[PDB]
């Protein structure tokens, strides 16, 4: 058999269909089996409309054999476009082999695996085009738009493999497909899934700043469009018109890298912010708040 046929066939039992149906609605996506207890990882937008209307929506998981089993929302993260589901007492579960997104290199051949039984299911072929690429993602329901540090791939990422794993040539998951194709790295997924399984929620850093992208000589980075009153930004000396060029130990090229850089900051730990103010370079100190206070 073929090199790609072998890998895709080896991971098909760990990939599942996720259907969220209602009286006048019927979303569908793909997921992956990450734990033998019934733990399934998908993206937030696949199940966003359902989590927001649990009264009218019902979610199920369709496996490779065809068994449709009820599923329960463990926890979701609109910030990383990630979500966990749980199927109860389902046996003989084929669990995906989780790989290391840190060892992933540009040019690495990959497969974007969709669920074999899904309506418009797709299995795509390509290579890793870019590592650590800040990418904006649209929020499905009432969910907020975010940006993620993704693995970029020339393999087609579409409705048919969205939520499904991004697999290497070793039949290991290195990422979850999103909605010119991108995937949430597995190393970030393992961190978000761990908090979403345990606490049903992930806490992310917040600073209270809105940024617009700027690229003009010295002023190349994220320009402060708005400051929130009482924000760690206001306490830190941050102003409008200001161009953020470094957040922590990470340079900020634009609004996209800013959102990602803020989320790599430690919660409650003082952090360096470097801005270009009215032509002058200025370092400001900010302590990051929890986005969810009663959950920190």
UniProtKB/Swiss-Prot annotation:
Keywords for the protein's UniProt record, in alphabetical order: Cell inner membrane, Cell membrane, Hydrolase, Membrane, Protease, Serine protease, Transmembrane, Transmembrane helix
Catalytic residues, chain numbering: 45, 81, 162
Coiled coil listed as a keyword: no
Residue ranges that the UniProt entry lists as topological domain Periplasmic: 1-293
PDZ domain residues: 191-252
EC number: 3.4.21.107
Coiled-coil intervals, chain numbering: none
Cellular localization per UniProt: Cell inner membrane
This protein's GO CC annotations: peptidoglycan-based cell wall; plasma membrane
Protein origin, superkingdom: Bacteria
GO biological process terms, semicolon-separated: proteolysis
Domain notes: The periplasmic region consists of a protease domain (PD) and a PDZ domain, connected by a ten-residue linker. Interactions between the PDZ domain and the catalytic domain lead to an inactive conformation.
Record's function text: Essential protein that may act as a regulatory protease that is conditionally activated upon appropriate environmental triggers.
Name recorded for this polypeptide: Probable serine protease HtrA1
Source species of the chain: Mycobacterium tuberculosis (strain ATCC 25618 / H37Rv)
Residue numbers of the full-length protein present here: 226 to 528 of 528
């Amino acid at each position: 058999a073929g090199r790609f046929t072998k890998v895709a066939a080896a991971v098909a039992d760990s990939v599942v269909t996720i259907e969220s149906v209602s009286d006048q609605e019927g979303m569908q996506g793909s997921g992956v089996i990450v734990d033998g207890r019934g733990y399934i990882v998908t993206n937030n937008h696949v199940i966003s409309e359902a989590a927001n209307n649990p009264s009218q929506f019902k979610t199920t998981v369709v496996f490779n054999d065809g068994k449709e089993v009820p599923a329960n929302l463990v926890g979701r993260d609109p910030k990383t476009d990630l979500a966990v589901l749980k199927v109860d007492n389902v046996d003989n579960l084929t669990v995906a082999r989780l790989g290391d997104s840190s060892k992933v290199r540009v040019g690495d051949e990959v497969l974007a695996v969709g669920a074999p039984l899904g309506l418009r299911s797709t299995v795509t072929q390509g290579i890793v085009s870019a590592l650590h690429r800040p990418v904006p993602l649209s929020g499905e329901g009432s969910d907020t738009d975010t940006v993620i540090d993704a693995i970029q791939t020339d393999a087609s990422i579409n409705h048919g493999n969205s939520g499904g794993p991004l697999i290497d040539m070793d039949a290991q998951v290195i990422g979850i497909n999103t909605a010119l194709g991108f995937a949430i790295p597995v190393n970030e997924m393992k961190l978000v899934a761990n908090s979403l399984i345990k606490d049903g929620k992930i806490v992310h850093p917040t600073l209270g700043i809105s940024t617009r992208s700027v690229s003009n000589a010295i002023a190349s980075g994220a320009q402060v469009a708005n400051v929130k009153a009482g924000s760690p930004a206001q306490k830190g000396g941050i102003l409008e018109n200001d161009v953020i060029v470094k957040v922590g130990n990470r340079a900020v090229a634009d609004s996209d890298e800013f959102v990602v850089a803020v989320r790599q900051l430690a919660i409650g730990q003082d952090a360096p912010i470097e801005v270009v103010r009215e032509g002058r370079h200025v370092t400001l100190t900010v302590k990051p708040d929890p986005d969810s206070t009663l959950e920190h």
